[PDB]
A paper describes a structure:
In the barley β-d-glucan glucohydrolase, a glycoside hydrolase family 3 (GH3) enzyme, the Trp286/Trp434 clamp ensures β-d-glucosides binding, which is fundamental for substrate hydrolysis during plant growth and development. HvExoI folds into a two-domain structure consisting of an (α/β)8 barrel (domain 1) and an (α/β)6 sandwich (domain 2) with a 13 Å-deep active site pocket embracing the subsites −1 and +1, positioned at the interface between the two domains. HvExoI catalyses the hydrolytic removal of nonreducing glucose (Glc) moiety from a broad spectrum of poly- and oligomeric β-d-glucosides.
G6SG-OMe bound tightly to native and WT recombinant HvExoI with the respective Ki values of 0.1 ×10−3 M and 0.2 ×10−3 M, hinting that this thio-analogue should be observed in the active sites of WT and mutants. This is what we indeed observed in WT, and the W286A, W286Y, W286F, W434A, W434F, W434H, and W434Y mutants, where well-defined electron density maps of G6SG-OMe and tight H-bond networks that were formed through eight to ten residues (Asp95, Lys206, His207, Arg158, Tyr253, Asp285, Arg291, Glu491, Trp286, and Trp434). We noted that the quality of the G6SG-OMe electron density map slightly declined in W286Y but that these maps were well-formed in W286A and W286F, suggesting that in the W286Y mutant the process of ligand-binding in (or near) the active site may have been perturbed. Our findings suggest that although the mutations of Trp286 to Ala and His led to folded but inactive enzymes, enzyme activity retention is more sensitive to alterations of Trp286 than Trp434, likely due to the proximity of Trp286 to Asp285, the catalytic nucleophile.
Author numbering: -3 to 602
The structure:
């Protein structure tokens, strides 16, 4: 179609499959293996990207151009890498990925949404879709085209450090929340074939259903461990939301570090090729987790030659190396040259990668849109996060006896009130893991409103608000307070650091609640990624709210405390009486919860 130097794959009017096949046919082995290689920005340079024909870059947790970087700085970084990739012989644009898992959370000033467990409490898939939409905008504000979300793990044991990344222990709730996908990517057309990838265009991002499969089913909630369950159970609990993801055109699937009945997912041909590709008809690309192929072996990295063979033969398409790319490319090249990995396998991997790139418009818009920068931290998105935080809250108790006046909602006008606890004025703590840093952090790490700040913004001007992080009993009794709001809970964590066999909150937390509630009527706000031992907190408190990890918009909490809205959240997980009961999930034989899945008290708006 019509100039003399015409190249079909560069023609935006041509069908995606025609463009894919036209480009594939022109590629060298080096160019093909390059496409299959994803590297950290930390090891990327223009020469590296060009010389190795690199297909993808990522920012892992906390991998940022600098602390406090603006949206424009991110765009300029991504564009710099893209300019190198576009300078190769074939000019294949790279795709840049990041964990935008509760907003564009590595980025300073990005709206931080509640983590997934709290989103499960909302039972509101349309809310989650709108969060996906807002997240896509804030990711594109930074020039990034690809989000490693949603985590559709079904966490079956809250001792797991990623339980907060799971919408629920109930697969039906996880299935419902796959609405994140068309939020991130755009809605698929009416004709759409389940398993095809889809992204609407330059204001949307490629999504990633992760981590395939059974990441939430590991023994004792040990992160990356073995999931011991028969096929029927894997298919009934851990797999269903992957089919919903196929139906919604999820562009990519990331493989789990975990094993199923002793077989590493990163080496499981039956599940990756036999099931995901051949049965579910997935036609996007399958990506490893970071050093996932290394961890096939024990010790990890002890036979990288085998790691490459096993993973690529299993059906993985793109390898999140993410650092030692030279070794990866060299070994894979050697395996192909020696006939150990057939060219058909390479061509399939590259077909899938290119399919996603062409489909999403990446060849047409390889560079960032500077007009999108202002989407970052946009007030409308914060208003959405505030709605989500409020809807996520689960009221567990509202009065010590059935005959007491209900404490909540609290009055906005009172002479003097107390706000207390380690989590009352700590933005990092209310965001939890995957916020600015990989593991999260403490204090004022980004733009947001803490619980204290939200209280001050809510109350009548005549209301005096006193803050004390850890007041003693005498301070509270002598203070002339009308009531107190006390916020305590878990510190930020991610992945194995969050694995926890005792699930008791750090001190001081309970001691502060006891001191405050002993002196004045108190509403306890519990910040956690999961159910934790809660009977002692309940015994002390007039009212208690499970607020999960509500994100940057602390006014979501006070919107419910002061009755602007009624409490509506319902537990998306079983609340255990004791960790000795675990695992214990709804539908089990000996089900003996402190609070069952679905429990939640309500209030009416005042
Ligand atoms: C300890 O090394 C750090 O690990 C984290 C998490 S591993 C892996 O990372 C993927 C890409 O960021 C996530 O999509 C996936 O869910 C995680 O399991 C990694 O983010 C850091 O880059 C790395 O320093
Ligand atoms: C399949 C798997 O990951 N199994 C691991 C095992 O290798 C390790 O010794 C144990 C204790 O850390 O945790 C589990
Ligand atoms: C009272 C108690 O057991 N606390 C421990 C804590 O020291 C540890 O950091 C955490 C991580 O697993 O587990 C819990
Ligand atoms: C404390 C309170 O107002 N509770 C009410 C409940 O009695 C009523 O049935 C419902 C619908 O009006 O709203 C809520």
């Amino acid at each position: 179609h019509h100039a003399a130097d015409y190249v079909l794959y560069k023609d935006a009017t041509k069908p995606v499959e025609d463009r894919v096949a036209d480009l594939l046919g022109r590629m060298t082995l080096a160019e093909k293996i390059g496409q299959m290689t994803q590297i950290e920005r930390l090891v990327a340079t223009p020469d590296v990207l060009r010389d190795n024909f690199i297909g993808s870059l990522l920012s892992g947790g906390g991998s940022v151009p600098r602390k406090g970087a603006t949206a424009k700085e991110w765009q300029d970084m991504v564009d710099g890498f893209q300019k190198a990739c576009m300078s190769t012989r074939l000019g294949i644009p790279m795709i840049y990925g990041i964990d935008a898992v509760h907003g564009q959370n590595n980025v300073y000033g990005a709206t931080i949404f509640p983590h997934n467990v709290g989103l499960g409490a909302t039972r509101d898939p349309y809310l989650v879709k709108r969060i996906g939409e807002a997240t896509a905008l804030e990711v594109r504000a930074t020039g990034i085209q690809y989000a490693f979300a949603p985590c559709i793990a079904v966490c079956r044991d809250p001792r797991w450090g990623r339980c907060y990344e799971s919408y629920s222990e109930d697969r039906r709730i996880v299935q419902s929340m796959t609405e994140l996908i068309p939020g991130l990517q755009g809605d698929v057309p009416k004709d759409f074939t389940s398993g095809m990838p889809f992204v609407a265009g330059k204001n949307k991002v490629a999504a990633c259903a992760k981590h395939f499969v059974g990441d939430g089913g590991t023994v004792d909630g040990i992160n990356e461990n073995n999931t011991i369950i028969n096929r029927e159970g894997l298919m009934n609990i851990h797999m269903p939301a992957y089919k919903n993801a196929m139906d919604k055109g999820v562009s990519t699937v990331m493989i789990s570090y975990s094993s199923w009945n002793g077989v590493k997912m990163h080496a499981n041909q039956d599940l990756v090729t036999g099931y995901l590709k051949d049965t579910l008809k997935f036609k996007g690309f399958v990506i490893s987790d970071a050093e996932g192929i290394d961890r096939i072996t024990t010790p990890a990295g002890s036979d990288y030659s085998y790691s490459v063979k096993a993973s690529i033969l299993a059906g993985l398409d793109m390898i999140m190396v993410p650092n030692k790319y030279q070794q990866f490319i060299s070994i894979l090249t050697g395996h192909v040259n020696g006939g150990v990995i057939p060219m058909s396998r390479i061509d399939d991997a590259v077909t899938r990668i290119l399919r996603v790139k062409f489909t999403m418009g990446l060849f047409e818009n390889p560079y960032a849109d500077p007009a999108m920068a202002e989407q970052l931290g946009k007030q409308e998105h914060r208003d959405l996060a505030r709605e989500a935080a409020r809807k996520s809250l689960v009221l567990l108790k509202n009065g010590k006896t059935s005959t007491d006046a209900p404490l909540l909602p609290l009055p906005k006008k009172a002479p003097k009130i107390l706000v207390a606890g380690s989590h009352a004025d700590n933005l990092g703590y209310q965001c939890g893991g995957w916020t600015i840093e990989w593991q999260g952090d403490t204090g004022r790490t980004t733009v947001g409103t803490t619980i204290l700040e939200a209280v001050k913004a809510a109350v009548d001007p005549s209301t005096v608000v006193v803050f004390a992080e850890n007041p003693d009993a005498e301070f509270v009794k002598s203070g002339g307070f009308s009531y107190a709001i006390v916020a305590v809970g878990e510190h930020p964590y991610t992945e194995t650091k969050g694995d926890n066999l005792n699930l008791t909150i750090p001190e001081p937390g309970l001691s502060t609640v006891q001191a405050v509630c002993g002196g004045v009527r108190c509403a306890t706000v519990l910040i956690s990624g999961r159910p934790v031992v809660v009977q002692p907190l309940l015994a002390a408190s007039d009212a208690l709210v499970a607020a999960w990890l509500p994100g940057s918009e602390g006014q979501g909490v006070t919107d419910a405390l002061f009755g602007d809205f009624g409490f509506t959240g319902r537990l998306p997980r079983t609340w255990f009486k004791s960790v000795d009961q675990l695992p214990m999930n709804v539908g089990d034989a000996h089900y003996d919860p402190l609070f069952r899945l679905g429990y939640g008290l309500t209030t009416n708006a005042t």
